[PDB]
């Protein structure tokens, strides 16, 4: 498996599942850790001898036929398939094995079937006594025991090779909301700001725009393929206009270049001025605000347009 997405989360809800057995690999974070290659397995083995696939254990099947990695990059994954291969009269079709030469190194896939000697009697091309055939029949019936009925044992193995991204999880996705301060993660472009549709002549191979001084402002949607602007929403300093703690205590809070539409109310070029009455009189500039507007204390805080003379 390479250049794919191995939907492990789907694999947790794909078929009948009985026994989870993991060793060395976390069973809950398979999607997050992207792997390189997966060599899938499918055991057809009675549950009596399945438990032998581990270091420090021996068996006619675990250490002879097809060996799982010692550093288990995966899980010992075994399920039940009692309703797959049951027939009346005894399913004597599948193949047993009697004996082999000796202990084998990990990952030894056997294909040849060289004749084996049991004692002092040599075979030399003779099959029979002390030279056994490598095949014997199974037994499967709808009336046989559950343990001796076939099991669907699909063991999954992983690899951490030094290769480009070839295997990982789906990670799912969410919906899009516009004109609100949200947190976005578009294939790594993490940030906060206001998302709104824009008309920018994006080239087909170009994903996300960027203005001077490396400030990303436009990103293409990975699904709808639309051009969306990016801008951080309103922020700015907060100033307090007071006549001093010797005549009164009323104050007017000014939010610098923050629009009054978002959190009396007066809108200026310097920002929204909350807590000051707007009057059309014109006197000397008492408390300077900006852009030709500056407030003063009369019997409240009132913002003028300063009179030159």
């Amino acid at each position, epitope marked *: 498996i390479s250049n794919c997405v191995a939907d492990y989360s789907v694999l947790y809800n794909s078929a009948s599942f009985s026994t989870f057995k993991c060793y060395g690999v976390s069973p809950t974070k398979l999607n997050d850790l992207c792997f390189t290659n997966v060599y899938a397995d499918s055991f057809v083995i009675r549950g009596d001898e399945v438990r032998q696939i581990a270091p420090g254990q021996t068996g006619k099947i675990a250490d002879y036929n097809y060996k799982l990695p010692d550093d288990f990059t995966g899980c010992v994954i075994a399920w039940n398939s009692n309703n797959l291969d049951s*027939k009346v*009269g*005894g399913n*004597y*079709n599948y*193949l047993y094995r009697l004996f082999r030469k000796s202990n084998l190194k990990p990952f030894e896939r056997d*294909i*040849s*079937t060289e*004749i084996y000697q049991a004692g002092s009697t040599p075979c030399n091309g003779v*099959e029979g006594f002390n030279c056994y*055939f*490598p*095949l*014997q*029949s199974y037994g499967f019936q709808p009336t046989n025991g559950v343990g001796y009925q076939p099991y669907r044992v699909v063991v999954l193995s992983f690899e951490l090779l030094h290769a480009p991204a070839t295997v990982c999880g789906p990670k799912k996705s969410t919906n899009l909301v516009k004109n609100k301060c949200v947190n976005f993660n578009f294939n790594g472009l993490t940030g906060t700001g206001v998302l709104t549709e824009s008309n920018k002549k994006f080239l087909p191979f170009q994903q996300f725009g960027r203005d001077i001084a490396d400030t990303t402002d436009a990103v293409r949607d990975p699904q709808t393929l639309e051009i969306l602007d990016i801008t951080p929403c309103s922020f700015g300093g907060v100033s307090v206009i007071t006549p001093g703690t010797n005549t009164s205590n009323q104050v007017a809070v000014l939010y610098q270049d923050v629009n009054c539409t978002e959190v009396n109310v007066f809108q200026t070029r310097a920002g929204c001025l909350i807590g000051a009455e707007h009057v059309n009189n014109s006197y000397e500039c008492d408390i300077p605000i900006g852009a030709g507007i500056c407030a003063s204390y009369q019997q409240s805080i009132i913002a003028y347009t300063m009179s030159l003379g």
Partner: nanobody
Amino acid sequence: VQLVESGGGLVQPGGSLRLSCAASDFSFYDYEMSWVRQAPGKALEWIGSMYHSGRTYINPSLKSLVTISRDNSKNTLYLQMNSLRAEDTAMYYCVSNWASGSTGDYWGQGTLVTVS
């Protein structure tokens, strides 16, 4: 098809029958071969199998009339079934690389047989 079989026909109950399918290269028969047939109204019934050396195991249910001859230079193998009964009006198949898996075997076409 790259695998053809010769044999069959209308035979009185009790006759003999044979099937011939052959290959060309020495290494094409690695490593497992077997035979199978699908009678109408009958499920799969595997009979026998053998490796390159020729060691054979046969399904004990119907293991009484099994006889097979094998060749290497001609790159052939024959499943001989005798005593043709009245329950063999079906199609047969011989398979190369039988055990290799779901996508590692190649199938055939067979010939029609009439039995009374």
